[PDB]
Structure 1
Amino acid sequence: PELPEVETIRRTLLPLIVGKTIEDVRIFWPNIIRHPRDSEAFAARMIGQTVRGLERRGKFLKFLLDRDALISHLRMEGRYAVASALEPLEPHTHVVFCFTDGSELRYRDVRKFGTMHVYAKEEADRRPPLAELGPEPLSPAFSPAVLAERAVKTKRSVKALLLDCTVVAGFGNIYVDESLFRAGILPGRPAASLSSKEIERLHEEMVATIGEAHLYVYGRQGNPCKRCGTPIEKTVVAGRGTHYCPRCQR
C-alpha cells in the first residue's frame, strides 16, 4: 500500500487492537524481524504488553505498546488482519500477535517482503528504520524551501531526489512519476536544473498527488496522454521504470 492506504489501515486497525494485551507472538519467517536480531527476543519482549496506540510515519506503522514500539512496513503486498485464534490462518501468514482475548493481529504477504523492528518507545525515532525519514509530505515541514535546498546541492536527477526517503516521507515510484507529470517536469532533469518556479510547482503537485489519493502516466506507456494525447513513454531513470509524457513534461 501507498501512504494514503497506510493511513486508512492505521485508522481502521487502531480500534480493533487498542487495549488488547499480547499473550504470544508466533513467527513463521524469522527474517521479517530486523530488530532485535533474534526473532525469539522480539517475540519474548512483546508478551504481556498492551496495545496503546497506532501512529503512521511515511509508509511505516508504529504500534505503541506499554514499553515498546513495533515499527512495521508492509511494502507493496503486505496485509494485516484481526481475526479469531480458532480459525485457520490465511496463506502466507508470517507473524501473528496473539492477544489474551483469543483474537490475533496477523501479518501476511505473498511476497514475504515486509520488515518489523521493536525498540523501547523512546528510542524508536532515533533508530532504523525511522531515524533518517524526511518530513510528512502533507505537513508544513515539507516546503518548497526544503525541496530547493536538497535540489541545489546534488548531481542527481529530480526523480532520484524525490525517491530519497530523507527528502520527504512516503514518495515511491508511482507518486513520483505522477507528481512530475502534473508539475510538467521531466524525471531525468538534474535536480539542480529546476528553477524556483519549477520547485514551487513540484511541491504543490506532490502535495496534491498525495492529498487527493486515477493515473496520468504510471504504467500507461504507449497509451495517449490524458492531457495532450501524446503517447506516454517509459525509460529507466534512477534505476527505476519511469513513465512520462514527452510533450507535457520539460
Structure 2
Amino acid sequence: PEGPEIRRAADNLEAAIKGKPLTDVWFAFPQLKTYQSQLIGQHVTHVETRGKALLTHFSNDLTLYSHNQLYGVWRVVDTGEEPQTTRVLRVKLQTADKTILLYSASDIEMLRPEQLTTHPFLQRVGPDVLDPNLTPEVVKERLLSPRFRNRQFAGLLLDQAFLAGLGNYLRVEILWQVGLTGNHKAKDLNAAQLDALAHALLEIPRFSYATRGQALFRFKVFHRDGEPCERCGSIIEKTTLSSRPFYWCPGCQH
C-alpha cells in the first residue's frame, strides 16, 4: 500500500473516530502499554500522513507513528465487533460507536512533539505527492537540483527522501505514462519530458487517491505482463529493477 492507499485509510480513520473521546486504548507491544491509561478520555485530533507514514495525533500532544510496510492494515469496525481474522492485532483505538484496529504492522511507536521532526524516517522524507501545496514547478526544481539531477529514476522514484508516497506501482505507472525506462536521469531529459514527468509524479498518485477506491484510475502496466499495451499494442513485460518487480512496455518506453 502506497501513499494514495494510506491517505484513503487515514481518511477512513478520521471519519470513524476524529474528535470522539476514547473509551479504550490497547497496544500489543509491552513498551506502549504505558500509554493506554494516559489516552483514555483523550481524542484523536487529526490523522496526518507523510507518504506511507501515518501520524495519529491525540489531544494531549502525543502522536502514534505507524508504518504498514508491505503487510500492515487498518480496519474500521463498530465498537465491540471484531471479525474473525488470522492477522495479529497490534493497536486498538475505541470510542462509543466506532473502533479502529491496526493489524500486522511492526513499526509502531509513540512520539512526543519534538520527535515529529527528529524521528529518523520523518527527518528524511521529502515533500509529499498528495500535499496540495506541492506544485509541478517545485517538483521540476527538485528533479533538476544538484541533489537529485544525477539519480537514475529506477531507484529515485522509490526513495522517500525524493518524494514521499511513491512506491513500486506508482514508479511503474508514472514511467509508463511519460514513455521512460528507469535508466534515465533528470539532467538528460528535454524540457518537454521533464515537465511531463514533474506533472505525472503528482497527477498519477492524486488520481489514484481520488478514484481507485471507486474516468477512474486503472493500471496500465502494473501486473499486466503478457497483455497488449493499450498505447502501442506491444506485450508488456515483467522483470526486476532495483530488487523489486518491474512492469513496462518495450514498444513505447525508452
Normalising by the residue count of structure 1, what TM-score does the alignment of the two structures yield?
Answer: 0.82
2:230 maps to what in 1? 226
Higher mean displacement: 227-236 or 90-99: 90-99
Structure 2 residue identity aligned to 1:152: R
Higher mean displacement: 94-103 or 15-24: 94-103
Deviations 1:162-194 (A, max 9, x none): 110000010000010110011111113355543
Residues in 1 aligned to 2:12 and 2:183: alpha-carbon distance in whole angstroms: 38
Deviations 1:4-43 (A, max 9, x none): 2322222232132123334543334x3xxxxxx9233454
Unaligned runs of 5+ in 2: 209-217
1:146 to 142, 145, 148: 142
Residues in 2 aligned to 1:100 and 1:140: alpha-carbon distance in whole angstroms: 34
Q: Secondary structure at the match of 2:10?
A: helix
Residues in 1 aligned to 2:120 and 2:21: alpha-carbon distance in whole angstroms: 26
1:73 maps to what in 2? 67
Structure 2 residue identity aligned to 1:11: D
Residues in 1 aligned to 2:108 and 2:11: alpha-carbon distance in whole angstroms: 19
Q: Secondary structure at the match of 1:151?
A: coil
CA contact (8 A) 1:74 1:114 kept: yes
Matches within 5 A, 1:36-75: 38-43=31-36, 45-66=38-59, 67-75=61-69
1:209 maps to what in 2? 204
User: Percent identity, aligned pairs only?
Assistant: 27
* 1:132 and 2:124 correspond: yes
Residues in 1 aligned to 2:172 and 2:14: alpha-carbon distance in whole angstroms: 32
Q: Secondary structure at the match of 2:76?
A: strand
CA contact (8 A) 1:234 1:244 kept: yes
Q: Secondary structure at the match of 1:54?
A: strand
Unaligned runs of 5+ in 1: 31-36
C-alpha displacement at 1:88, in angstroms? 4.1
Provide closer, same or farther for how the CA distance between residues 95 and 148 of structure 1 changes in structure 2, counting only shifts above 3 A.
same
Q: Secondary structure at the match of 1:247?
A: coil
Q: Secondary structure at the match of 2:8?
A: helix
Q: Secondary structure at the match of 2:123?
A: coil
Residues in 1 aligned to 2:178 and 2:112: alpha-carbon distance in whole angstroms: 41
Q: Secondary structure at the match of 1:64?
A: strand
- Give the count of matched residue pairs: 237
Deviations 1:41-96 (A, max 9, x none): 454654453222222221222111022011222344412323323x3454224224
* 1:247 and 2:251 correspond: yes
Normalising by the residue count of structure 2, what TM-score does the alignment of the two structures yield?
Answer: 0.81
1:170 maps to what in 2? 165
* 1:161 and 2:165 correspond: no
Residues in 2 aligned to 1:113 and 1:58: alpha-carbon distance in whole angstroms: 16
Q: Secondary structure at the match of 1:130?
A: helix
Higher mean displacement: 212-221 or 11-20: 11-20
What is the root-mean-square deviation in Å for CA atoms of aligned residues? 2.6
Residues in 1 aligned to 2:63 and 2:244: alpha-carbon distance in whole angstroms: 32
Provide closer, same or farther for how the CA distance between residues 58 and 88 of structure 1 changes in structure 2, counting only shifts above 3 A.
closer
